[PDB]
């Protein structure tokens, strides 16, 4: 019973900013995926069991992760914004001895210039 | 005085099943890991089945599905309920055991292996 | 030195009185039964857990191996290097020590396999050589270790922890949660635990003494 709550969502200009949140006993990994349209789902970011954050190429240098373990949310602030971001961006979570994925519905990110 | 003792090896015609046993004997103060292992002729000891001491159970690739572990905390016997046996399941079954001695005074465990079971399909 | 503690205590008592002075690629071992404070004491070094009394000081980033093995929705590779630079050499190395050649060759799609859902659920060992690896292969100055043959074969074990903890990382600085006198016989320096007190402290020539 993961129950994922994603929030944050939008429609910016390029160069723009979004924060993304996600709510959610033992955590393994809590993260972030996304699906642009035809394309199938790729990691952006996860943060580990010691806060260890990992980061994707394209999102390098331009994303952080920052997770509450004292309220079980992770915050995706995602900075310098172009158009290839454009994607529904999933939270994940790892969880149990036998590390079960459970995902959230997803929320919708445009980058776009209108 | 700690040993591993095997049963249920032999001979048996394929598509037939088996049931092998391991024991252990002797001053136990706790056991943690047990598994069953197999020897080809000629080729290298390879693991058939592992259980943890609350009884998680990895398999081989080549028994899934087929064979079976279980293990009694209480007696430290550890069986592979070896269902359905292929031709080229024929080999020197082994018993692995992580042995704390009641001599031991840390909680801190040791490799034991048993006399190897022949098993011909 | 890479990592210390002195006079340490935690409350979630979980670890009472923990003292250890480690050295730079020094192995450490820390040992007890199931609820001693092994899973917790790491916790302490990675910041996750607070103590109430005493200070750790150490120097360098630290890589942890999860207890339970967890895979990330991707490729098996991805389940390695991800977020860490690939380093074609570096990478090889993990595959060959982390017992995962074979494991990966028997597919179809090799280290490229996507193990997410509809995909290829991957045995409770080889989700362990995985973890292993995702560890191994991060550059970090300190690596803990927790119980990461505690669903392998003591076959396998035996050949990830001697090409692997007593040679891949034989200059990085260690600490691996065992309770196998075998590995014990290889450490630096050996912690023991019973609900949270140091029972043991030293080397494996103070413990081969008792
Ligand atoms: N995530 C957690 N939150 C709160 N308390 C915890 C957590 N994990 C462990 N504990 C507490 O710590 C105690 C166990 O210590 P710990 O898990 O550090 O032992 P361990 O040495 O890792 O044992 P094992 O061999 O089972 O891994 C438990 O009784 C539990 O109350």
Redesign the pocket.
Known sequence: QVQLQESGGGLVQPGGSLRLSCAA??INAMGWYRQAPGKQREPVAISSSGGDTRYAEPVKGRFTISRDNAQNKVYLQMNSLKPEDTAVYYCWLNWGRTSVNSWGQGTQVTVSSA | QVQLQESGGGLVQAGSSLRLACAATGSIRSINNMGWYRQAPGKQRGMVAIITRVGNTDYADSVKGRFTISRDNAKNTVYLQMNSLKPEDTATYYCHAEITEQSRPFYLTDDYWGQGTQVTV | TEVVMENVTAF?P?LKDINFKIERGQLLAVA??????????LMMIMGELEPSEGKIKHSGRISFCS?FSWIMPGTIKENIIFGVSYDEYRYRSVIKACQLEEDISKFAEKDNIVLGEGGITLSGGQRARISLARAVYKDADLYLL??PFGYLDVLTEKEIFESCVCKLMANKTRIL?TSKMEHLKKADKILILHEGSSYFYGTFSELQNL
């Open positions: 006993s033992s | 979630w979980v007890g039964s199931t609820g001693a404070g092994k899973t917790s004491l207890q927790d119980s949660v």
